[PDB]
Design a protein around this nucleic acid. Sequence first.
RNA 1: UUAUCUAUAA
Length: 801
Amino acid sequence: FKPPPRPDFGTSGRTIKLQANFFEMDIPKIDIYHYELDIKPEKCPRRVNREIVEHMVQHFKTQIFGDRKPVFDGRKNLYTAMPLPIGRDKVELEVTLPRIFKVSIKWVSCVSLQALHDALSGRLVPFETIQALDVVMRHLPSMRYTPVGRSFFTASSNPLGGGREVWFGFHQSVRPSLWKMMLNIDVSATAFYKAQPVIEFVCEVLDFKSIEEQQKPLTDSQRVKFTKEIKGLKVEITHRKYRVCNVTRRPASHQTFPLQQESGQTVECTVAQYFKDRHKLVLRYPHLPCLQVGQEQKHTYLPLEVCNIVAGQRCIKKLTDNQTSTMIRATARSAPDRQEEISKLMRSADFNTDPYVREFGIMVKDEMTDVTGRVLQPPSILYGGRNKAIATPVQGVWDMRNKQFHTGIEIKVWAIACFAPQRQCTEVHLKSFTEQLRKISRDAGMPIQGQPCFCKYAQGADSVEPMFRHLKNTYAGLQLVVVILPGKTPVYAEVKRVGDTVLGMATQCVQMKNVQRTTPQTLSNLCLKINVKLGGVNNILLPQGRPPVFQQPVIFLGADVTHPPGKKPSIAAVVGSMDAHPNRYCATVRVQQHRQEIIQDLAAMVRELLIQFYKSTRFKPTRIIFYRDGVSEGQFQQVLHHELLAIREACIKLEKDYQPGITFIVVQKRHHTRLFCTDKNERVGKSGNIPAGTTVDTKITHPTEFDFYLCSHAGIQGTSRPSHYHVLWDDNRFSSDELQILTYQLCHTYVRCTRSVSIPAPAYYAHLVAFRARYHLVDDHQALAKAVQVHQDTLRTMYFA
RNA sequence: UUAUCUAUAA
Ligand SMILES: [Mg+2]
């Protein structure tokens, strides 16, 4: 129900000077006065509400507001530094924008900043005081810029193509820490739609240099693709803003709507004819479809050539792989560069001269908060083979030179299925690919003996299943099927569907480009995946170098939900460790309500995993460590309540007497906390990021509760994101050190690479499982749940790697 | 689909 208090502060690891993008706030101990606004109409967007309030204050300066500078959240909440002269009697006013709005205002409450001050000093926090402050800090930026969630953006020019742009901006949030309010400031970038004529948008989306080419009506594929892009976007009439709900199938010349004549009789009129009569405009592109806008009942159709994409619309739909890359490149920058850009932003913002921030007596320090971090020692990684070598991670990285798998699978029989045309992937490549792959495999401790028992070409996803059917029936003890692919193909989804859910055969895909040109590291990394799919153990944590939680049987869980890019379900995935290393993880997966973050059927999934744990280890875990992927800030209270109880329920419906301690940990990567090295000698790599294993549980952390930051990974590009961990529940009474080290060591058990990853393997695996479930669904609730279900032989292994 | 990190999420 309520999160546990911080048990202690960590002492493990060597100290390191850090700077966080948290700026200390000096806040008065006054009382803010909270007024409620009811504006009619009641569903105008926040910007309209803000200008209504802006004009309202200036208009009623004489008798109401005077010299005061109130702040406003854009909805119903308005705050003042000192009380307005109306006591508590509601007041009805009328505001005029260039049209009329009835605005009532009644005093509702006071917000004590003193109540916050001591909430920051024991007294185990008022969310409403934090919200009031938040409204003060972001009142001026809300008028000045384009707000998006907790961020602000403006147009600077930076195209991603396909009618999209990169706008730069910043995140802003007011955050509690011990003995201070903090202002979290980070630079940000996000995708926006270009403000352009829809015609040009059609060109960029359909790759037209000129609308003049394509002088004919769109194909069906052209049309609906254009539909998916513009659908839901707002357009404006050059001639009034509208919401596009659909694109017509018919061209403007033949698309019709019911038009009532003066006789009262309605007749079907074409869009082209209507615009010719009513607006005296002859359509230049009548062969193109129309935009359906507003309520569908209204039959409102707009020609493309009279519409512009409305400025300031953030792109939410998934970017193409190239759009993503261009965005990554344009936004990525080293830790020092980011640290400087934040500084510039602080100078530029200049919060101390902000009238509203001044009005409420607030002050913001221009220096980044100094924080002492602790670089935890990494675990040793025990390999096997003849050598039994131990790897010592350096900078969150290690390798397999002169090392062999803990338990390497001795592969004897295996097949190859190449879906690339031999025109590009001749038998030359396959046999050299095989030769190089085996030498690396020999060295890896997972030796592939003998040439592949089977190697054929094939094409089309239509041929996967029968080809796979053939293989399992004709080759005894067939261990692996190496599939080769061209590029992005639906064959992949089919290969995984048949392989994971139907026949239960281990399949390893690889692209044609990688087939042609093989490097040892790429091959070695490919062997990492292959070995675990066949039930091998690449490596394990050094058993003696483990936290004491492993003293008694324990299961490690990872949970996450992947959401669709309407009417498609979200997919919940929960993985569970099946041994004491811990290496092997069993997956559970559930389809559920569209965009529901809460794992509905979690109790059944935990039950299932506890059974499998017992079946694998003959032990019932005395402790359940639950790493839950990040959740929306309101949803924390919702998630904790349903899912913590679901976990308890699983234990009880298993046995009345079964009651293991649960540790519920939310792991967040989606925040804007950035940590920088104070001393340049501590910078790692070209990106100059903090070293792997850096842990912060002081200064910027929660005043009462048990949370910490842990940057477990090496920062390769841009600025690192230290994963935030928040313990919402802990029966096991973990110390700070043991939990932090446990978490850090679990980040070294990720089998797809010999590096410490940014989150613990369980959480990462959960994401892989949920993501793999999408591909299983590519081909009605009963059917979907079934299509997601994995083959029971496959369920043993980590097929998702 | 070798892999981590990385910016979003009328
Ligand atoms: Mg998630």
